[PDB]
Ligand binder design. Structure first.
Ligand code: MZM
Ligand code: ZN
Length: 259
């Protein structure tokens, strides 16, 4: 590898050389990659995909949030977990991070019926294994974010914290908030899409069971813009953090199912 991985926007916005997505190493060139476009009418209903159970999602916490140089990430340190969702085990929550742009019609990694959303939020969980690595070691819950004029009060603690972590490796503490504050209303999360894929940054390991919820989070345009306005890819603050999005990958011979 001749330089550090980057997103296209970083290569375009700086003279410092870096490895763009089509040139990424690791497992990034293998054939079960994410994100993908989901043709919603072609995903078959699987009745075994029931409701999710969220643990620790309703509890108010003061989360640590940090700029890791390619996103903003909340550290969930196993303080939450999930089960159900047609998942084979409970999964422990590790981190939450986001991908975004500064235009309403792009910013998501996945697309639904060829539509990208303003952001996409990933909550990353790790499988509770038994004795008897796997294709489903990691469960990522993906939520699409739609831009509008509705102020999302739940997001405010996160949005306000952004001012405090402009540069990579900076961390801060968010005001009291729960994970549910960040999500659509729980009852609306019964409809989701499911497929097997990869992590969307190097080394892009093919060990993710993906869930993409049908119901979008509503965020005000200016709450979304706060991400590109307050954050930077680099300590020199030369490239505002936005378009931290991997281009679409081919489904190949994989199948997408839905609840
Ligand atoms: C270690 C870890 O969780 N990193 C991640 S989370 C992730 S993502 N964007 O959720 O698929 N991609 N990568 C590389
Ligand atoms: Zn992600």
């Amino acid at each position: 590898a001749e330089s550090h991985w980057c997103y296209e926007v970083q290569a375009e916005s700086s003279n410092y050389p870096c490895l763009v997505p089509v040139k990424w190493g690791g497992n990034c060139q293998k054939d079960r990659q994410s994100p993908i476009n989901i043709v919603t009418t072609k995903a078959k209903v699987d009745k075994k995909l029931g409701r999710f159970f969220f643990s620790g999602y309703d509890k108010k916490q003061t989360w640590t949030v940090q700029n890791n140089g390619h996103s903003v990430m909340m550290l969930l340190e196993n303080k939450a977990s999930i089960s159900g969702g047609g998942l084979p085990a409970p999964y422990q929550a590790k981190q939450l991070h986001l991908h975004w742009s500064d235009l309403p019609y792009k910013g998501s990694e996945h697309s639904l019926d060829g539509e990208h959303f303003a952001m996409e939020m990933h909550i990353v969980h790790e499988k509770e294994k038994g004795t008897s690595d796997p294709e489903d070691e990691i469960a990522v819950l993906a939520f699409l974010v739609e831009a509008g004029t509705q102020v999302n009060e739940g997001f405010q603690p996160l949005v306000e914290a952004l001012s405090n972590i402009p540069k990579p490796e900076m961390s801060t503490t968010m005001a009291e908030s729960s994970l549910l504050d960040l999500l659509p209303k729980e009852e609306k999360l019964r409809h989701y899409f499911r497929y097997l894929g990869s992590l969307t940054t190097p080394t892009c390991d093919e060990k993710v069971v993906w869930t993409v919820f049908r119901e979008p989070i509503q965020l005000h345009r200016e709450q979304i813009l706060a991400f590109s306005q307050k954050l930077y890819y680099d300590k020199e603050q030369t490239v505002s953090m936005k378009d931290n999005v991997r281009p679409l990958q081919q489904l190949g011979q994989r199948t997408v199912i839905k609840s």
